[PDB]
Amino acid sequence: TPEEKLLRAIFGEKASDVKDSSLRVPNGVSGTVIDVQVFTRDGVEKDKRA
Amino acid sequence: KPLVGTGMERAVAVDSGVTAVAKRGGVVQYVDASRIVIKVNEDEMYPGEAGIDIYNLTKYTRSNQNTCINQMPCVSLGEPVERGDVLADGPSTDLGELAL
Amino acid sequence: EIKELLKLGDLPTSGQIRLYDGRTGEQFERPVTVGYMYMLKLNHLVDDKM
Amino acid sequence: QDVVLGLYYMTRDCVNAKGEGMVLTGPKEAERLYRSGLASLHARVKVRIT
Amino acid sequence: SVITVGPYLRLHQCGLPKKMALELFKPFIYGKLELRGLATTIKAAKKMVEREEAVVWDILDEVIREHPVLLNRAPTLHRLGIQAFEPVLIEGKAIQLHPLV
Amino acid sequence: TEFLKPRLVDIEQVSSTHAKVTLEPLERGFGHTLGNALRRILLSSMPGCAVTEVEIDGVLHEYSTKEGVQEDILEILLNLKGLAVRVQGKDEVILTLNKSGIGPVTAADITHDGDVEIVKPQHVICHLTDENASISMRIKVQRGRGYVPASTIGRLLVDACYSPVERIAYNVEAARVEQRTDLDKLVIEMETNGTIDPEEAIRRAATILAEQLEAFVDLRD
Amino acid sequence: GSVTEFLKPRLVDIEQVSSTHAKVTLEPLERGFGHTLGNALRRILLSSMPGCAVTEVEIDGVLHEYSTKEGVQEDILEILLNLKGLAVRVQGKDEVILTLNKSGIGPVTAADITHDGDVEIVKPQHVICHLTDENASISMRIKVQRGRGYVPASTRIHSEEDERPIGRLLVDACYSPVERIAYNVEAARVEQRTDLDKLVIEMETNGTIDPEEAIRRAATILAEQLEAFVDLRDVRQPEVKEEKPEFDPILLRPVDDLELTVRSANCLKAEAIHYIGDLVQRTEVELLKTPNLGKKSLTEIKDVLASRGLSLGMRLENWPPAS
C-alpha cells in the first residue's frame, strides 16, 4: 500500500521477497531445551548444525 | 513411597516395565545415573562366556501425555542383589513399591 | 489395631487433636482431625485448561 | 454447607460451661467473646436488644 | 478456565485471571492506551501489551472497572446458567467464583 | 534487603465514634499480625474509667426491686455499664446520684464533680414513675484494665468496662501493588464510645504494644 | 504525657538444645501481652527472616539440569536438590562463589568445598554427590546470596544477566532459616507479684542463625511496622505522570541495541557514549578522532544508524528531560 511504500521509504526498504514462518515457543509456556533433532530429506544439503 | 498402602503396589511397579528389575542375581559392580552393571556371580550360564549384565536404563524422555519418564538407580555400588528385585527405579515408584 | 498403632509412637488414640489458628493463634473450639493422607496431583490441571 | 454449619454453630444453646446470665448490650458482647472468659454457646444469657 | 472458590468476594464480583483478562479486553486496552497517551499508535499499543509493561496493567484496571463479564457453566438448564459479574483481577490462572451463586 | 512502608492511608469517620482506617502497602501476614495485635491491645490493654461498684439506698442485693422506678436493679446496673467516665487524675472516685420526681434520670443528675467528666450527660440511667418516687445511690468509679466481669453490705457488683473501645474488627483484602503481587491491605473498623477518639485510640494501642518488645531493639546501624 | 502503668519484657535463659533446636524464654510478661506477642513473633519468625541460600550453580560439562555425568550415581536434578539444603552462613557479604572440586571413589559432601574464610558451614556432612569410578571428577561453582522469603527461579525470568551462559543452572531459593516455630504462655513464677506469665518460644532452625539476632530482628520488624501506626497524615500520591514525549523514544535506548561490531562497541564505551542519544548527535569529525576507529567502524556506525531511520551527527539540544 502507498502509505506503506512511503513508510519503508522513510526508514529503509529492504523489502525482501521472502516472508517468515519460524517455529516459536507458544505464548504462555516457558522452559529449557533438552534435545534438538533434525530429519533431513534424502537429497538435500545437510545443515551445519545438523 | 506411600505411607498407608495395600502391599499390592510393590507388585504393580515390578510387573510393569517401568522399573528395571534384575534379570540375573549377583553383585553390583558399577552404579551410575547413566547405567548399572552387575556381575552374575552365583551360577552364570552353561558356557563360561563371561558373567556381567549391563542395564542401560532410559532417562528423561517424554511420555504420550508429555510426562517426565525417567529411571533412577536405587541400589548402591558393590551391593549384593538376588534375581528379581529392583536395581533401577522408575517414574512414580519407590524401590519396588509403587508411589503415585 | 489402628488405635493400637496410635500408641507405641505416642499419639491421641482418637485421631483428634486441638489446633491453633496461626493468624490469631487462638485455639479452635473443637478438637480437629489431623493425620497423613496419601494424595496425588492428577493430570488435567491449569495452564492447559485456560 | 459451610456457611450454614457456621451459623448453626452460632446458635445451638448449650447449658452452662462458662455461661451465666451476664447481661450487656449487643455489640459489647463481641468484646466479651474475643476476650474469652465466657464461652459462646451459653447459656442462655440475657442482653438488651434494640 | 477451571473455577475456584472466592470467599473474600462480594455477590457482584468474580475472580478473573490477569493474563486471561489481558487477552480478552485487547481492543479496549488498545483504545484506552492510545486515548491517554503512552502508545503513539494502535500498533504501538499492541507492541506495548505484547510486552506486558507494568503500566498496561493499571490501564487494564481502568478498562475492567465497571465493565461486567458474564460467566457460564456447561449444563445450562435455566436462566441462571449465565450470570454477570464485575471483573476482579486475580494473580492466577484459575477463575474464582462467589460461593453463594 | 529489609522491608517497605505503607504509603496510601485512608480514614473515614462515620461519626465521632465509628470509624474505618485502611492501610494498603503491607507484606504477607503483616496485616493479620498487626490486626490481631492491635485488636488484643484495644480490647483489654486500654485504660479508661468505668463503673465497678454501685450502692443504692434500699437496695442491698442485685435481685431486689426499687420503688418508683420503672427499671429493676439489673437494668439499672446495665445502663450504668454504658456510663462513659473521664477522670482527671485519680485511681478511684466516688459519685453520688440523688434525684426525685417523674421522667428520665440522666447523668446530668449526678453530682457535678470537678475532676470527673461525664462524656454523655443525656445518657439515660433510670425512669421514675410517680412524684413520690426518689432514688439515691453511690457509684464508685475506678481506673483499671480490660473487661472486669462478675467473677471479681449493699455493695452491688457490676461488670467493669475498663475499655473505651466497644468492638474491633479488621479485614485482610489483597492489595493490588504496582510492583509486587502477594501484598495485603489491613482495614481496621473501630466502634468506640466517648472516652477517647479512634484517632488517638489506635495510636495509643500501637504505643502500648511499642512499650513491650522494645527491649530487644538496639540501634547503631 | 502522664498515664498508664504497664511492664516490660526481657530475655532470660536461651537453652540451646542442639545446633538447630533452640529455646527463647521471655519471663517479665503480663497476661495479655504474653499471649499477644506470641503470634506476632511466630509469624515474623516463620517468614520475614533473612538467611543465605543457593541461587545459581555452574557445573563443568553440564549444559541443562536434565542431563547426567559419568561416574555420578545421582543425576543433575538430584544434585541441585541437595544444594538446596546447604547450610551456609556468610560473614559480611551479599554474594559468594563457593568452588567445589573433588575426584575419586566416594561420597562428596559439603566438606569437599573449598573452606572460605567468610563462609561458615553448619553441616559439612551434607550429602551432595556420590562419585563411583576412581577416574571420575567434578568441579562446580556454587553461588550463595542473602535474601528473604522463598523467591524461586521462575520469578526472575531474565531480569538478571542479559547474556548468562548456558552452563548456569538456576535453583529455587529457600531463604528463611527457620523451620518451625512454637510458643507456650505458661504461668510465670516471678518472685515478685502473682499474676504474670512467661512467653516460652520453642524454636527450630537450620543452625545458620542464632536466637539472639533472630528474635531481635523479628521484634525490630514489628516495631518498624508499628511505627506507621503513630501519626496518620493519610498521605496521598501525586500521580499525574506526563504524557508527552518531546523526542523519539528510541533515543532512550543504549548503543547495544544498534547491534554492531565489538570494536565499535568498545570505542563507544570508551568515548563515554552510552545511549544512542549521544551517538546520534556526534559528527564524523569527532568520530575520526576516536581511538581505534577507522573506515570500517565508521561505515558500520552510519549503516546501523541509517537502517534504523536515524542519521549521524544531528542536533537536538534537549538532552535529557526531565525527571
CATH number of domain containing G322: 1.10.150.20
Residues of chain B with Cβ-Cβ distance to G107 below 8 Å are none
Structural domain containing residue F13: 1-47+163-221
Residue G254 belongs to a domain: no
Quickly tell me which residue has 510426562 as its cell.
Answer: B67
User: Taking a C-beta distance cutoff of 8 angstroms, is the pair G48, G56 a contact?
Assistant: no
Co-location of G191 and G83 in the same domain: no
Q: Is F139 helix (H, G, I), strand (E, B) or coil?
A: strand
C-alpha distance from A42 to closest chain G C-alpha (Å): 31
Question: Which amino acid is residue F34, in one-letter code?
Answer: L
Find the DSSP H helices in chain G: 32-46, 76-84, 211-226, 262-270, 276-279, 284-288, 295-306
Contacts of F36 in chain C (CB under 8 A): 23-25
Which grid coordinates are listed for G204?
527450630
Q: The cell 463503673 sits on which residue?
A: F51
For residues G67 and G202, state if they share a domain: no
Buried b (16+ CB within 10 A) or exposed e, A7-44: eeeeeeeeeeeeeeeeeeeeeeeeeeeeeeeeeeeeee
CB contact under 8 A, F167 and D27: yes
Domain final residue pick, G175, G204, G220: G175
Amino acid at A14: K
F158 to chain D: nearest residue by CA? D22
Whole-Å CA distances, G317 to E77, G252, G278, G282, G305: 69, 15, 11, 12, 19
* Residues E93 and C50: beta-carbon distance below 8 Å: yes
Q: Count how many domains chain F has.
A: 2
Q: Do D and A have ≥3 inter-chain CB pairs under 8 A?
A: no
G6 within a domain of the structure (yes/no): yes
Among G26, G225, D37, G213, smallest CA distance to F209 is for G225
Contact F98, F139 (CB under 8 A): no
G319 strand-pairing partners: none
Please choose, from the candidates B91, B86, B97, B93, the residue with its C-alpha nearest in 3D space to the C-alpha of residue B65. B91
Residues in chain A preceding a C-to-N separation beyond 2.5 angstroms (breaks): none
The answer to whether residues E58 and F178 touch, using CB atoms and an 8 Å cutoff, is: yes
Suggest the residue from F212, F217, F219, F221 to mutate for an interface test with chain G (most G CBs closer than 10 A): F212
- C-alpha grid cell, residue F128: 421514675
Q: Dihedrals φ, ψ of D16, to 5°?
A: 45, -140
Does the beta-carbon distance from D31 to F147 stay under 8 Å? Answer: yes
Please tell me the distance from the alpha carbon of residue G70 to that of residue B31, in angstroms, as a whole number. Answer: 10
Measured between CB atoms, does E57 come within 8 Å of chain F? yes
Q: And the C-alpha cell for F11?
A: 480514614
Residues near F176 by Cβ (< 8 Å), separated by ≥ 6? E61, E89
Closest CA to F126 of F180, F85, F71, F167: F71
Strands of the sheet with E69-72, listed across from one edge = E3-5, E95-97, E13-17, E82-90, E69-72
- CB proximity list for E98: less than 8 A, separation 6 or greater: E6, E9, E10, E11, E13, E14, E85
Instruction: Extract the C-alpha cell encoding F206.
Output: 500501637
Q: Are residues G35 and G55 in the same domain?
A: no
Cis peptide before G322 (omega within 30 of 0): yes
Say if strands E3-5 and E95-97 run parallel, antiparallel, or are unpaired: parallel
- At residue G15, the 3 state secondary structure works out as strand
Q: Are the beta carbons of G219 and G41 closer than 8 angstroms?
A: yes
Asked if F51 contacts F143 with a C-beta cutoff of 8 angstroms, the reply is no
Do F1 and F64 belong to one domain? Answer: no
Contact status, residue F47 vs residue F91, Cβ threshold 8 Å: no
Among G155, G240, G241, G248, the strongest candidate for a mutation testing the E interface, having the largest count of E CBs within 10 A, is G241
Residues of F in contact with E58 (CB under 8 A): 178
The distance of Cα G283 from the centroid of its chain, to the nearest Å, equals 44
Q: Per the structure block, which three cell numbers stand in for A16? A: 525482501
Three-class DSSP category at G285: helix
Distance CA B12, CA B59 (A): 20
Question: How many CB pairs lie under 8 A apart between chains A and G?
Answer: 15
Pull the grid cell for residue F145. Answer: 484494665
G155 & G213 share domain: no
Residue G313: CB partners within 8 Å, gap ≥ 6?
Answer: G280, G281, G282, G283, G284, G285
Q: Which of C43, A29, G260 is nearest to E19 (CA)?
A: A29
Residue closest to G206 by CA, chosen among G43, G88, G81, G111: G88
Q: How many CB atoms lie within 10 A of CB G106?
A: 14
**Any idea which residue has 521477497 for its cell?**
A17
Residue G246 lies in a domain: no
Cell representation of residue F55? 450502692
- Give the strand pairing for E82-90 and E13-17: parallel
Closest CA to F98 of F60, F72, F137: F137
CA-based nearest residue in chain A for residue G310: A11
| Chains touching A, CB cut-off 8 Å, 3+ pairs | G
| Residue F38 dihedral angles phi and psi, to the nearest 5° | -60, -30
Residues G70, G169: one domain? yes
Which residue type is seen at F147? Y
Query: Residue G159: which CATH number?
Result: 2.170.120.12
HSE-up (13 A, CA, CB side) for residue G16? 9
Query: What is the C-alpha end-to-end distance of chain A, expressed in Å?
Result: 40
Task: Note whether G161 and G309 are same-domain residues.
Answer: no
Contact C23 G39 (CB under 8 A): yes
Element (H, E) at E61: helix E55-63
**Residue C29 burial (CB count, 10 A):** 11
What are the start-end ranges of the E strands in B18-85?
20-21, 26-31, 36-39, 53-55, 72-73, 80-81
Q: Do chains F and A touch (3 or more CB pairs under 8 A)?
A: no
What is the spatial distance between Cα F124 and Cα F108, in angstroms, rounded to a whole number? 9
Same domain flag for F122 and F99: yes
Interface of G with E in 205-264 (CB under 8 A): 243-244
Q: Single out the residue in F111, F141, F162 at which a domain terminates.
A: F162
Residues on chain E touching G243 (C-beta within 8 angstroms)? 36-38
Chain C environment of B5 (Cβ under 8 Å): 38
Same domain, F52 and F158: yes
Which of G175, G199, G221 is the last residue in one of the domains? G175
Same domain for G271 and G169: no
Domain contains G251: no
Strand blocks (E) in chain E:
3-5, 13-17, 69-72, 82-90, 95-97
Q: What is the CATH number of the domain that holds G193?
A: 3.30.1360.10
Query: Does F63 lie in the same domain as F13?
Result: no
CB contact under 8 Å between G71 and B32, yes or no, is yes
Residue F66's Cβ-side half-sphere holds a number of Cα atoms within 13 Å equal to 28
